[PDB]
Enzyme design. Structure first.
Site, PDB file in Angstrom:
ATOM      1  N   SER A 289       0.596  -1.031  -0.158  1.00 52.88           N
ATOM      2  CA  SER A 289      -0.063  -0.026   0.368  1.00 52.88           C
ATOM      3  C   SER A 289       0.843   1.413   0.192  1.00 52.88           C
ATOM      4  O   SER A 289       0.795   2.158  -0.930  1.00 52.88           O
ATOM      5  CB  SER A 289      -0.817   0.202   1.029  1.00 52.88           C
ATOM      6  OG  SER A 289      -0.682  -0.079   2.098  1.00 52.88           O
TER       7      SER A 289
ATOM      8  N   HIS B 287      -2.132  -8.976   1.650  1.00 56.09           N
ATOM      9  CA  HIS B 287      -1.361  -7.692   2.484  1.00 56.09           C
ATOM     10  C   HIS B 287      -2.713  -7.128   3.296  1.00 56.09           C
ATOM     11  O   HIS B 287      -2.041  -6.755   4.560  1.00 56.09           O
ATOM     12  CB  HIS B 287      -1.567  -6.324   1.640  1.00 56.09           C
ATOM     13  CG  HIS B 287      -0.932  -5.129   1.661  1.00 56.09           C
ATOM     14  ND1 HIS B 287       0.000  -5.478   3.318  1.00 56.09           N
ATOM     15  CD2 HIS B 287      -1.254  -4.248   0.696  1.00 56.09           C
ATOM     16  CE1 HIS B 287       0.008  -4.070   2.916  1.00 56.09           C
ATOM     17  NE2 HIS B 287      -0.314  -2.778   2.296  1.00 56.09           N
TER      18      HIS B 287
ATOM     19  N   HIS C 207       7.105 -12.680   9.109  1.00 50.57           N
ATOM     20  CA  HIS C 207       6.878 -11.463   8.306  1.00 50.57           C
ATOM     21  C   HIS C 207       8.097 -11.883   7.981  1.00 50.57           C
ATOM     22  O   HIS C 207       8.751 -12.512   7.290  1.00 50.57           O
ATOM     23  CB  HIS C 207       7.465 -10.465   9.116  1.00 50.57           C
ATOM     24  CG  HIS C 207       6.577  -9.050   9.015  1.00 50.57           C
ATOM     25  ND1 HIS C 207       7.572  -7.850   8.467  1.00 50.57           N
ATOM     26  CD2 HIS C 207       5.612  -8.309   9.031  1.00 50.57           C
ATOM     27  CE1 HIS C 207       6.155  -7.436   7.718  1.00 50.57           C
ATOM     28  NE2 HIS C 207       5.441  -7.309   8.454  1.00 50.57           N
TER      29      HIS C 207
ATOM     30  N   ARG D  78       4.191  -3.198  17.316  1.00 50.07           N
ATOM     31  CA  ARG D  78       3.350  -3.508  17.234  1.00 50.07           C
ATOM     32  C   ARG D  78       2.351  -4.246  18.285  1.00 50.07           C
ATOM     33  O   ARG D  78       0.767  -4.003  18.918  1.00 50.07           O
ATOM     34  CB  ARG D  78       2.821  -3.398  16.040  1.00 50.07           C
ATOM     35  CG  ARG D  78       3.138  -2.274  15.482  1.00 50.07           C
ATOM     36  CD  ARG D  78       3.168  -2.343  14.127  1.00 50.07           C
ATOM     37  NE  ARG D  78       3.652  -3.042  13.479  1.00 50.07           N
ATOM     38  CZ  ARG D  78       3.199  -3.860  11.938  1.00 50.07           C
ATOM     39  NH1 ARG D  78       2.933  -2.625  11.287  1.00 50.07           N
ATOM     40  NH2 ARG D  78       3.741  -5.023  11.604  1.00 50.07           N
TER      41      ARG D  78
ATOM     42  N   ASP E  20      -0.928  -9.035  12.669  1.00 49.18           N
ATOM     43  CA  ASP E  20      -2.119  -9.618  12.998  1.00 49.18           C
ATOM     44  C   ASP E  20      -2.616 -10.320  14.073  1.00 49.18           C
ATOM     45  O   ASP E  20      -3.702 -10.555  13.795  1.00 49.18           O
ATOM     46  CB  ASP E  20      -1.985  -8.983  11.974  1.00 49.18           C
ATOM     47  CG  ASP E  20      -2.236  -8.366  10.994  1.00 49.18           C
ATOM     48  OD1 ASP E  20      -2.151  -7.042  10.713  1.00 49.18           O
ATOM     49  OD2 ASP E  20      -0.690  -8.557   9.831  1.00 49.18           O
TER      50      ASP E  20
END
Ligand code: COA
Ligand code: COA
Ligand code: OAA
Ligand code: OAA
Lengths: 449, 448
Positions: free
Chosen positions: B244, B274, B320, B329, B375
């Site tokens: 993005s 994504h 990742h 995060r 996530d």
């Protein structure tokens, strides 16, 4: 459909070949990556794959290994409309996908697929288009219309239901047939609503794809049909690296369907640095006509060109960096103009420039290319037949470039290339580390190799 | 606005510094470009500039040199809402743009700018949204509404009229303020129309940006406002190379305005590889709960993980494309959960995964990164507070990521970087010359 059976045989082979290449040549060095690439828009960095087309400095673009002349007239001529000369984009699309030349029947199957599907644009797409204010830029409308049609995506639907990676290319193909059929309908809607009093003309089921665009825009002339066939053929594809083709591939790499990837691409094409070159050439030609009260003489054009080049400026459409010969897409357009509108006054200026501007550029000494590109020629052809809405020129470009974008997107999903994800660097790091870094091609660089 | 005064000084300097770096150091080599890069999606290739954030494989993301712990808790704590703990995304944006930590007043000025401009979403944007069939994917609706508002672009308009290249960053900033203010209104509109019976809630002029999205979606609990502030902070930016951010930069590179570049980015974020990981993880967590009639034991989960991997499956929320340790995060979200919903059953599964799954992925030995990413934790938080519409999770992600994308687009236009235009190669050429090329870091490479 023949196209599909053939791809069902070729794609499994290509997929395997590419896996082997990545394995046995993955570590081969093609070039140095520099600080300059990172801050210079990756210019020249060999960072993407495209097999549909390929630019040779001494020949210009080829399509799956064939030159424009071979496909347009030579011994491999692609099928035409009944009574036509110009190659049908439908057949070129067969070639881009398969790497093989279509038969007349191959082309006719593709034409029928397009004609059928061109009746299947959802009514809500037109609702979307009509909800946009009519003064919205036509490339904004074009991208929006395309994206709204994402609801009809077979790839998106099949992906959510669970399909094998091996079926990706099948869904991409089905979607591409639908989207390509829709593009001329959407484009014409925009044209008629903005510029021709919001009266709308239906697709003719007895015209091919390019001709139907001209028809639906309101231009019923055999010459216009032939121009549009040639135009769509010429602009179909130009490697993978230009902003719109790259945007397409990038969004595609995340498994976004063709409505999403191609609308994204059109947002890139709408950029003033990517999508306006043809218009700028045309306005320049028109500025010369007005400056000289008509076609300038050879001596006036020479002097004006010297004045421009000595004052640091360039001549639009000429002297780009890559080719060492005239763009073969320029040559085909000139051949069309000589045949079909030789006395048109703006064409006479474009023709005189083809004589004069390369002579002046050789003498001026900067450009290893004194020759023009495709955008030098296209605008006067559109303007001659009464397509005069400059903003809309980029939409015609977009419809054409959909041929190569859809082919690329189908193929890379066939190859199963991974998500595109480069590494970004910070100016902080650069400032810290730059002294430490060798100059590319230097002896120290050889040492640190 | 303090923000803009600060940029009006910093950007001229940065522009000069970048021109200097390009002249002086352009020819410096950073690495070898290989065939594998071209067919491997440019993995590792140092091809882009991003000054807003930087992902350290062994520490996770830093925003202008600051860690998430520094900004959320630690010695450089960003401003919060009145009575809040979570950092306001408005102050993070100030930091991303300027590289300087904002004051309270700086943040209030940005908040007010968003508040005012949130009232200025054109009526025709809603007409566009209502003309799309209600069963359209929410990320298609989001992208389309953003794109329709391109008609209000100040950059487009000023570029047409003739503006100097030095005014670029200013038109980008104005556009960014407008677009950012519009995103929550558009997102909420979508949410309400699809999932809450097409009843619409107006923006609240006295809430901050994140809280206002929650409010317009129909959630007014303090804890939900705090979750949205944290969520919007964490997902704001992650270097320039993700699909993005990169799509935004690529389209912006052709001088397409932020409505075009950011709507293009959202079409990329909509892709399964994504923007879907959040939802996949939550469904996986819920599958476990249902499979074991509650929270599994360590041994059940261990066994399940092994059975999963050896059956060819991926464990969602772990691994990742760049990260190599625990995503900070993730850790911030775990902290929020321990604080606010420690007894939530689904959270108890997520927690247990944190103990068991790394060990397993290490021994299995295929994942380069055995640890959780952002996530792995976001879905259970949304789900707990009643945001259950899986498909819409990507839209929340998008609203957050606009903060990074707008900061990057403003900066790159301030720097005056050129059009992104790499070279594609063909398989035909690869087959022709590959054997004759040097292996990267070889003796023959050195000689050549
Ligand atoms: C010098 C030359 C050989 C190379 O052109 P180029 O300017 O490098 O071409 P690009 O479009 O890739 O890049 C445009 C750059 O020119 C810059 N530029 C143009 N005029 C400038 C000026 N007066 N001051 C500063 N930069 C200027 C733009 O800002 C942009 O950024 P950069 O200088 O930071 O890199 C040129 O004469 C030429 O031939 N250009 C055409 C090449 C080309 O791209 N062809 C298109 C093939 S499809
Ligand atoms: C994020 C992800 C796509 C990165 O993929 P990548 O960069 O190719 O990962 P790696 O380099 O570690 O891949 C090496 C191997 O480990 C495997 N692997 C990586 N993460 C894994 C996981 N969580 N579970 C199982 N296997 C995994 C890969 O599939 C690969 O095996 P292969 O060579 O047979 O295909 C991947 O870790 C993944 O699929 N994760 C689960 C989904 C998710 O959480 N995504 C959100 C990312 S922010
Ligand atoms: O789209 C084009 O005209 C081609 C192009 O810019 C490129 O290859 O970089
Ligand atoms: O950075 C990536 O590759 C994916 C990601 O985590 C993000 O975009 O936030």
């Amino acid at each position: 459909m023949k196209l599909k059976e053939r791809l069902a045989e070729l794609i499994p082979q290509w997929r395997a070949e590419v896996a082997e290449i990545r394995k046995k040549y993955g570590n081969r060095k093609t070039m140095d990556c520099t600080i300059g690439h990172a801050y210079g828009g990756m210019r020249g960095l060999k960072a993407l794959v495209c097999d549909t087309s390929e630019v040779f400095p001494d020949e210009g673009v080829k399509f799956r290994g064939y030159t424009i002349p071979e496909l347009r007239e030579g011994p491999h001529k692609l099928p035409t409309a009944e009574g036509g000369f110009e190659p049908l984009p439908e057949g070129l699309w067969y070639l881009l996908l398969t790497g093989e030349l279509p038969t007349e029947e191959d082309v006719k199957e593709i034409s029928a697929e397009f004609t059928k599907r061109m009746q299947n644009v959802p009514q809500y797409v037109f609702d979307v288009l009509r909800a946009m204010p009519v003064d919205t830029h036509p490339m904004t409308m074009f991208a929006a219309g395309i994206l709204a049609m994402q609801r009809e995506s077979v790839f998106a639907k099949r992906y959510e239901e669970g399909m094998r990676r091996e079926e990706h290319w099948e869904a991409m193909l089905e979607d591409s047939l639908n989207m390509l059929a829709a593009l001329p309908v959407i484009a014409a809607y925009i044209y008629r609503r903005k510029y021709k009093g919001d009266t709308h003309i239906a697709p003719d089921p007895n015209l091919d794809w390019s001709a139907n665009l001209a028809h639906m825009m309101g231009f019923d002339d055999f010459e216009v049909y032939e121009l549009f066939r040639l135009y769509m053929f010429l602009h179909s594809d130009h490697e993978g690296g230009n902003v719109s083709a790259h945007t397409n591939l990038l969004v595609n790499s995340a498994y976004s369907d063709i409505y999403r990837s191609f609308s994204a691409a059109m947002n890139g094409l709408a950029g003033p640095l990517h999508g306006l070159a043809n218009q700028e050439v045309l306005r320049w030609i028109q500025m010369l006509y007005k400056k000289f009260g008509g076609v300038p003489t050879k001596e006036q054009l020479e002097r004006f060109a010297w004045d421009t080049l000595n004052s640091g400026q360039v001549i639009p459409g000429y002297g780009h960096a890559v080719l060492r010969v005239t763009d073969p897409r320029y040559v085909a357009q000139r051949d069309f103009a000589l045949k079909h509108l030789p006395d048109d006054e703006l064409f006479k200026i474009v023709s005189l420039c083809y004589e004069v501007i390369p002579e002046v550029l050789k003498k001026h000494g900067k450009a290893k290319n004194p020759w023009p590109n495709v955008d030098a020629h296209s605008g006067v052809l559109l303007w001659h037949y009464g397509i005069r809405e400059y903003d809309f020129y980029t939409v015609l470009f977009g419809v054409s470039r959909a041929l190569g974008c859809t082919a690329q997107a189908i193929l890379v999903r066939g190859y199963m290339l991974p998500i595109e994800r480069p590494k970004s660097i910070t100016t902080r790091w650069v400032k810290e580390v730059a002294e430490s870094l060798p100059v590319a091609g230097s002896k120290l660089a050889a040492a640190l190799e």
